[PDB]
Amino acid sequence: VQLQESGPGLVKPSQSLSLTCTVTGFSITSDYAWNWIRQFPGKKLEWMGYINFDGGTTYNPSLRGRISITRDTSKNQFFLQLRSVTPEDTATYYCATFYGAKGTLDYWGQGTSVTVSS
Amino acid sequence: VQLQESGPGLVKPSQSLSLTCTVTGFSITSDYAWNWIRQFPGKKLEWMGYINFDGGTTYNPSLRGRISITRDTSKNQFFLQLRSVTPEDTATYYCATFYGAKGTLDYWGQGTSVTVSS
Amino acid sequence: DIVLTQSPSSFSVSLGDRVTISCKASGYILNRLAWYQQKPGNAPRLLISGATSLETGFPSRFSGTGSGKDYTLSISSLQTEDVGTYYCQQYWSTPWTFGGGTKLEIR
Amino acid sequence: DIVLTQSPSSFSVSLGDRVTISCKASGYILNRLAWYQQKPGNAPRLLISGATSLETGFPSRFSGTGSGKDYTLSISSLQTEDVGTYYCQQYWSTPWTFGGGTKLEIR
Amino acid sequence: AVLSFHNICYRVKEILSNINGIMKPGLNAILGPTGGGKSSLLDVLAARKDPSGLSGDVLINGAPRPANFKCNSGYVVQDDVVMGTLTVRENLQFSAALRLATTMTNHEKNERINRVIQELGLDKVADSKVGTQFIRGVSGGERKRTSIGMELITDPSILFLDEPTTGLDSSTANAVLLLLKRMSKQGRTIIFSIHQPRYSIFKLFDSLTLLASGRLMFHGPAQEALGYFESAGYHCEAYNNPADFFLDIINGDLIEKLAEIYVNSSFYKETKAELHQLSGYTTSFCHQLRWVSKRSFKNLLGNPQASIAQIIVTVVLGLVIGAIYFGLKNDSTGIQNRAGVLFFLTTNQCFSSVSAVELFVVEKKLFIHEYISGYYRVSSYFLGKLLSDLLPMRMLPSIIFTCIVYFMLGLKPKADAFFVMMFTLMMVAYSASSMALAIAAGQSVVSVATLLMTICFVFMMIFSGLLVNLTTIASWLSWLQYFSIPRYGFTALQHNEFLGQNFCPGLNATGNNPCNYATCTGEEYLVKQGIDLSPWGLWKNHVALACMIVIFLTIAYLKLLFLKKY
Amino acid sequence: AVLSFHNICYRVKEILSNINGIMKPGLNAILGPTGGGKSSLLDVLAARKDPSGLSGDVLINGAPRPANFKCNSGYVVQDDVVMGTLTVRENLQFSAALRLATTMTNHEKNERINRVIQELGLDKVADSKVGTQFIRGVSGGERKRTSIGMELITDPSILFLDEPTTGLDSSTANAVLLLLKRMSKQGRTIIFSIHQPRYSIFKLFDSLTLLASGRLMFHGPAQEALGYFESAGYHCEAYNNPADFFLDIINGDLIEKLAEIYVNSSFYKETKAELHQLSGYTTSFCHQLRWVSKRSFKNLLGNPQASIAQIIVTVVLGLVIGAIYFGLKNDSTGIQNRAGVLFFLTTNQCFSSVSAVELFVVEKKLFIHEYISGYYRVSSYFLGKLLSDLLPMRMLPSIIFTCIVYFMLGLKPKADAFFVMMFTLMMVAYSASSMALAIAAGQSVVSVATLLMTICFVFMMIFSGLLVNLTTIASWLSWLQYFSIPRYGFTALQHNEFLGQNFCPGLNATGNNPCNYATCTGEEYLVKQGIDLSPWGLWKNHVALACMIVIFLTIAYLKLLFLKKY
Ligand SMILES: COc1ccc2c3c([nH]c2c1)[C@H](CC(C)C)N1C(=O)[C@H](CCC(=O)OC(C)(C)C)NC(=O)[C@@H]1C3
Ligand SMILES: COc1ccc2c3c([nH]c2c1)[C@H](CC(C)C)N1C(=O)[C@H](CCC(=O)OC(C)(C)C)NC(=O)[C@@H]1C3
Ligand SMILES: *[C@@H]1O[C@H](CO)[C@@H](O[C@@H]2O[C@H](CO)[C@@H](O)[C@H](O)[C@H]2NC(C)=O)[C@H](O)[C@H]1NC(C)=O
Ligand SMILES: *[C@@H]1O[C@H](CO)[C@@H](O[C@@H]2O[C@H](CO)[C@@H](O)[C@H](O)[C@H]2NC(C)=O)[C@H](O)[C@H]1NC(C)=O
Ligand SMILES: CC(C)CCC[C@@H](C)[C@H]1CC[C@H]2[C@@H]3CC=C4C[C@@H](O)CC[C@]4(C)[C@H]3CC[C@]12C
Ligand SMILES: CC(C)CCC[C@@H](C)[C@H]1CC[C@H]2[C@@H]3CC=C4C[C@@H](O)CC[C@]4(C)[C@H]3CC[C@]12C
Ligand SMILES: CC(C)CCC[C@@H](C)[C@H]1CC[C@H]2[C@@H]3CC=C4C[C@@H](O)CC[C@]4(C)[C@H]3CC[C@]12C
Ligand SMILES: CC(C)CCC[C@@H](C)[C@H]1CC[C@H]2[C@@H]3CC=C4C[C@@H](O)CC[C@]4(C)[C@H]3CC[C@]12C
Ligand SMILES: CC(C)CCC[C@@H](C)[C@H]1CC[C@H]2[C@@H]3CC=C4C[C@@H](O)CC[C@]4(C)[C@H]3CC[C@]12C
Ligand SMILES: CC(C)CCC[C@@H](C)[C@H]1CC[C@H]2[C@@H]3CC=C4C[C@@H](O)CC[C@]4(C)[C@H]3CC[C@]12C
Ligand SMILES: CC(C)CCC[C@@H](C)[C@H]1CC[C@H]2[C@@H]3CC=C4C[C@@H](O)CC[C@]4(C)[C@H]3CC[C@]12C
Ligand SMILES: CC(C)CCC[C@@H](C)[C@H]1CC[C@H]2[C@@H]3CC=C4C[C@@H](O)CC[C@]4(C)[C@H]3CC[C@]12C
Ligand SMILES: CC(C)CCC[C@@H](C)[C@H]1CC[C@H]2[C@@H]3CC=C4C[C@@H](O)CC[C@]4(C)[C@H]3CC[C@]12C
Ligand SMILES: CC(C)CCC[C@@H](C)[C@H]1CC[C@H]2[C@@H]3CC=C4C[C@@H](O)CC[C@]4(C)[C@H]3CC[C@]12C
């Protein structure tokens, strides 16, 4: 219901990327699904994956084995880990909410920019 | 959304019973299902049947072949015909609405009493 | 079919008291349980749907709790506008069935 | 997967005018279509769900109409707060896909 | 007619080493143990073996054997190849229609048949059924005479018989051989292979050819073999059959020993001198097809058990299905029941179309015998047998099933839907039957073909669209779904049935979806299964079946055309 | 030993009219046409026919035949009943373990077997397999000697043989009969029925009994029948077999004519005078069960083809299923795929358990022969054959299927669920196999049993809970669902799998249902199918299977106990 991203804004190639989304106003283990989306320069939206309220996860096939989504219910967070990074996946990352009964991404974060350079 | 019953308040045994429910505020061919319910003296509720928005109908098995529900979309009405009446089915009859996505009888009529005597 | 049974066919309480009503089903219902309130001279009025959800237009004094075949309606700190007859209905199987009804009184 | 295509990658209109945006899908979607509005410097904001329903918080100037593989968003009598980028999304199959986006301008 | 064979050596390994002899009008027998060339020399003389392995020369009245030989020469098989369901007259009519010339009149053919029946002595059984499992028929002693008549129709000059008495009883065999002798006295050359005869038979032979292990132990008049073996260093005691005496010698009471003895015998010299003295389609395609079809349909009607049984089973099963699924509802359970009943119908058609394995397998030997003899081509036989058995007995069950269940269940009440369902069932049945024919054409055992058919149909059912969603399968495997007949049939039935249906009472899902996970319309169900909603998405399936049919019915033909007839 | 039969008249209609004679130590043959009592008199003398229809008296050394007769008398069948998969030594060991007394030592049994093998002349093949389809074995001439040894193990005084030479070749038959004569010279009474012998055989007989159409045309020494028929008004020409001569007389080159002639003959008077001169379990249950089990398991291992093939098919099918259904998802398509795979597993177990029809059908004749001879009881044979063949080859496929597919698919990752699935598959397999045994026990043809099994399983599948919802069926028919093995298995698997599952991503249906028509939990699916959510609702199914097993395995036993052994 109130999401906030955080994490490094600069990454070396082919090492890793780790972002954290903190949720306030709701418990991530109760109802919804929690997604990660990215927007490239030259605006183009891409859905990466989500983790469900019961711990199950689903990922975009275009990201074969590079992505993992985890959670920590003790402080209501979920984390995105994108490994073996390349300068093409330099983009703006958002965390979003998915109700399911309605089907749409209702709540979004403020978005954090990630630059892959050297 | 606004239902009103009407029909004879007194019937001879084993002849017929015909009631009419007029709907205002909504079109009976659009969304919902339209049910008939009856309440016996010595309060006991019994669901008789319904007609759906597409003309399909469903009836309570305890009323084997005695009941038919019809409709007239020209003036937004649906009719209940209960044949071969007996003095046991003397009761108060209501017409009610059923949404389906919610599952409950939301809107009810004012109810009309029917006495089967001789 | 599925027969719904309400054990307390009648009750007796006083204002400010807490009262509980029970509905027991002969089959699994999966929270497809509704509670209707009826006053003398009026049609039944929907009070609870889904066995937990409360309908808009009623105070936050009625609550619904149950699972499987046992469900209960709790009225805490009842008032005089709460006296009447209460019915449990199941909308799981097509021949929808009501309970026998429980009438509340005032001491 | 299902690829969504928006033909008018850019538009050009003036205030009070009527504008129409189109989304074409490579597969049947069954009204599982949503429209998002994005301003520069902000995250996308849900505007339409179900291809017809309008979200609370937006005027009754946006409308959605479509069936099968063709869907359209109509903005009648557009204002200056309506300029931005518009995306169509399908939530039928698990790899949810967005459209390329259509940017509105002002003449 | 005089058939002379010189320096015959057939190799497959060799079976005949070196054989010489002549056979003149009369009774000529070929005796010996089973291993020897008793039955191989008969095929070689009869041109029923591959000339590739043949070495020596076979001659008739000084001229080699023409390509018109097998048509002018009769060959009687050991076991019966008569249609047990027809009558003694009908078999001869069928033989005469295809073995005789079309220039003749039906009156002439009937006169020939009457003469043949009179000569054989089948007047009192000419209109009785030869006999099958279900049908009571004539004794085994007159089936053989019917088979002999089927070859005498053309009135040949040379008649070959493979073990005419094996299987028969003693009193039957004696009468059969007396009949053969009476025929031979008319001026026919009869050449037969016997298995350990009795003296009442041996006393009738006019020439004897004794073979053992591919070697000629004796050739000459049958009445002098006793003297030959007596003078060769052996003695026969009284009350011992000479035919048993010869085989006792052969067994040992060595092969090259007897071979050399005969090669040094006088009879060998006489045979070599005589041999060095001398040397030194019928009808139209339509006629063949018509007669094959007529015979096949007569056999189909005259075996009411295995054809009526299928109809009875179809009706019973349809009534049971209509009782179980009576009154389909437009509620939460309508989708499940509709899909289930359509799936069952389709898979039942596919699995009931396994009986087609019996079509070309039961009558393989008859087909080979009649093709070698010049009755008909492969094309005409194939098309006629398809037109008589497969078509009507696969078209009817679908009609019955549809007409019974469609209205009991309460499916889409339109005429076009009804007929589309009928046609789809028909096509799936035909395609499965064609696949069975392709798999089982040319074989001779039903078991392996049936097992392979069952396995293939099981995998096809897996890939039909009910047990597994076809949109969830991995890319490196999904393509297999295009090799499934049930998939096409089931998809067509679903498309025809589910289109304009609602399944959530009280809810108008057709307009909008309130909840995303409801599945309240047929379109949603179809799309969720991977089915196209356009009319093409229906008819596509049908063409995919038609091609299959063609392909399979081609393969079967090529498995009959390239089948070894020898 | 001297076996004397007086005024025998067996009626089923009558087959034997009136027969008298005696048989002393030596070679006694019973000749005649096939219709006559050639083979019936042999059974009557051997006590292998129902005494109900018997009239006359059979006597041994003046005393009637005791109930201990068939145990002390050997009977050799025409066709082979030797286990082609064992060795010549193993068959004799099995015969000796059950036909001899337990008081003896294994050393004594081995010495008896060695003596028998030496007498028969099977020393060089004593350790070679007799032979089956897949296994190459000994010639047909030594299988017969093995069969004779299996009866000589007990060293009887009377030996009955039904057509010992039919099927064999001439040189084999001569050696067999010379062996029989050598045995008879030791002091054994050999009584056999021959079919049209040769003179080399006829010269060995010591007594002859000629029967035709149930009438005694001659009885006396075999060497005087020629003189009898010569003096009776007939003549035999030279080089004619006397055995063929007799049947030629019988056929006609009348039955009462020859019967009366013999009744007025001198031999009849001598036989009547001689006949009026005179008249006027072995082992424990456990031992039998152990040996039956050992033999059955040796046969199972020694036929690796039809048992290894099932394992190979199971593994291949499991891998294919795990590849198609790899990675089950908790989404809209999870329910469909889970239900489909469980349904396929259950129905495949039921249909693959059709091979059990072969258990008691292939070895019916051997069972009857060994039961009459006093080898074992029905109970021990039945239990041993269940314990050796059915149990291990039905327990293994389930284990393989589960171990392969459970983790590829990604089902409920608990140990108890894994083992419950395994046990359920095992039980359904056993129940289907028991039903097959009950249907097919006592029969002799696999086809009808297989067809009936297939039909029953098809109807069971209809009533399993996927193709039709069991809560929608009419009351006057729903009860049939309680006669479905697949229903119980499928219900148990569903209950084990679906309980704590979610299938609507993003939605917490377990708490509340937002929309009424979603089906977002396993509990909803189960209840919608009519399944109980309590643990009883699982184990109930299992007991319903166990009872079935018991019942069926009882019926089969009663179909073997009341089976006609005569
Ligand atoms: C959905 O999964 C399945 C799996 C297997 C089968 C089979 C059939 N349906 C199936 C469905 C039908 C049988 C049913 C109608 C009961 N069937 C046949 O028709 C033929 C010949 C019928 C016949 O001749 O039987 C007479 C009584 C003699 C008339 N034989 C067979 O092996 C298949 C087996
Ligand atoms: C869900 O609907 C159905 C309908 C029909 C079937 C059948 C089977 N499963 C089914 C499922 C299995 C076959 C599968 C595993 C491929 N099957 C058998 O096992 C036996 C004997 C197997 C055998 O011996 O084959 C060797 C290669 C020689 C080892 N024969 C039969 O007729 C049934 C047919
Ligand atoms: C379901 O709702 C749709 C619209 O929500 C109904 O169809 C509309 O009907 C109105 C009045 O007849 C027309 O003006 C619209 O053009 C229709 N829209 C469409 C898309 O068809 C429909 O009638 C409802 N269902 C049924 C069974 O009537
Ligand atoms: C689904 O919702 C239920 C309740 O709506 C959750 O269970 C509740 O959890 C709270 C906090 O842990 C407890 O205080 C309640 O007693 C629970 N109620 C019940 C009925 O269990 C449940 O956790 C949610 N789903 C998941 C996967 O967590
Ligand atoms: C409604 C369904 C069952 C109709 C199927 C048509 C069947 C009955 C038709 C199709 C082709 C027909 C055959 C075509 C040619 C001939 C040759 C003729 O000299 C005798 C009849 C015979 C053998 C016909 C018998 C009837 C037949 C087999
Ligand atoms: C009597 C049996 C042998 C006939 C089986 C094949 C028939 C039923 C097939 C052949 C051609 C088919 C028709 C071809 C074209 C049309 C027109 C279309 O707008 C609806 C379907 C409809 C009406 C089809 C229904 C099925 C059909 C009539
Ligand atoms: C859905 C999939 C797995 C179903 C299985 C399809 C494959 C295995 C089936 C479909 C049709 C089958 C073919 C049908 C006809 C022939 C011609 C014959 O002369 C040899 C076998 C052969 C070549 C079959 C081999 C197996 C086959 C190709
Ligand atoms: C021996 C057999 C398997 C030969 C191959 C036959 C099968 C695999 C071939 C023969 C005809 C083919 C079909 C012909 C036409 C169409 C329509 C097209 O829009 C999709 C493919 C589809 C549906 C083809 C699928 C593959 C197909 C069914
Ligand atoms: C129209 C749909 C149902 C398919 C119809 C297929 C039938 C008509 C096709 C399939 C295979 C075809 C056969 C294939 C090959 C030959 C060989 C040729 O020298 C004569 C025709 C003949 C014998 C064909 C006749 C027509 C035939 C039997
Ligand atoms: C895991 C599964 C396959 C185990 C099944 C157990 C099988 C292998 C067991 C069950 C009963 C056992 C038999 C019990 C009794 C005997 C008699 C003995 O003198 C020889 C071994 C023999 C014949 C056993 C062989 C092995 C056997 C058949
Ligand atoms: C190895 C093969 C032959 C064994 C097959 C039968 C086994 C697996 C059966 C026999 C008894 C069964 C167990 C009986 C009781 C329990 C305890 C319960 O709280 C969970 C199920 C569980 C654990 C069962 C699982 C399946 C089980 C272990
Ligand atoms: C779901 C329903 C329709 C499945 C069909 C169940 C009925 C028809 C089946 C279930 C088990 C079957 C029985 C199994 C065993 C026997 C014993 C045998 O000596 C005669 C057949 C008989 C008596 C069978 C008759 C048919 C039978 C009773
Ligand atoms: C020849 C055969 C069919 C004999 C009859 C066997 C079948 C019909 C009988 C044998 C054992 C029986 C089961 C025994 C125990 C239970 C548990 C109970 O809570 C419901 C009935 C149920 C599930 C029975 C159903 C009917 C049943 C399966
Ligand atoms: C426990 C579950 C799996 C069922 C086990 C069934 C087995 C153990 C039962 C089923 C039928 C039973 C047989 C039925 C009848 C008899 C006849 C009796 O004079 C000896 C025992 C004997 C031969 C029984 C032995 C045990 C038996 C084979």
Residue numbers in the entry:
A (entry chain D), B (entry chain F): 2 to 119
C (entry chain E), D (entry chain C): 1 to 107
E (entry chain B), F (entry chain A): 35 to 46, 61 to 301, 328 to 354, 369 to 654
Copy text from the publication:
In particular, Ko143 (2) was shown to be nontoxic and highly potent. A drawback of 2 and 3 is the presence of an ester bond in their structures, which can be hydrolyzed by liver or plasma esterases, thus limiting the applicability. This problem could be alleviated, at least in part, by replacing the glutamic acid-derived C-3 side chain in Ko143 with a simple methyl group. All four structures revealed an inward-open conformation of ABCG2 with two copies of the inhibitors bound to the binding cavity. Ko143 and its tetracyclic derivatives are all oriented such that the C-9 substituent of the scaffold points toward the apex of the binding cavity, whereas the C-3 substituent points toward its cytoplasmic opening and interacts with the internal cavity surface. The two copies of Ko143 (2), MZ29 (3), and AZ99 (7) in all three cases form a “triangular wedge”, occupying almost the entire cavity volume. The phenyl rings of two F439 side chains, one from each ABCG2 protomer, stack against ring A of the inhibitors. AZ99 (7) and Ko143 (2) each form only one hydrogen bond involving the NH group of the indole ring and the oxygen of the side chain carboxamide group of N436. To visualize these changes, we superimposed the structures by using one TMD (termed ‘reference’) as an anchor and observing the structural differences to the other TMD. This revealed a very good match between the TMDs of ABCG2 bound to Ko143 (2), MZ29 (3), and AZ99 (7), consistent with the similar binding poses of these inhibitors. Relative to MZ82 (6), the calculated binding affinity of Ko143 (2) is 0.25 kcal/mol higher; for AZ99 (7), it is 2.40 kcal/mol higher; and for MZ29 (3), it is 5.30 kcal/mol higher.
ABCG2, also known as the breast cancer resistance protein (BCRP),1 is a clinically relevant ATP-binding cassette (ABC) transporter that limits the cellular penetration of toxins and drugs, thereby promoting physiological detoxification and contributing to multidrug resistance (MDR) in cancer cells. It is constitutively expressed in membranes of numerous tissues and tissue barriers, including the liver, the kidney, or the blood-brain barrier. Structural studies by cryo-EM have revealed the architecture and ligand binding pocket of ABCG2.11−14 The transporter is a homodimer, with each half consisting of a transmembrane domain (TMD) and a cytoplasmic nucleotide binding domain (NBD). In an inward-open conformation, two TMDs form a slit-like substrate binding cavity. When inhibitors bind, they occupy more space in the cavity and act as a “wedge”, preventing the TMDs from closing and the transporter from proceeding with substrate extrusion.
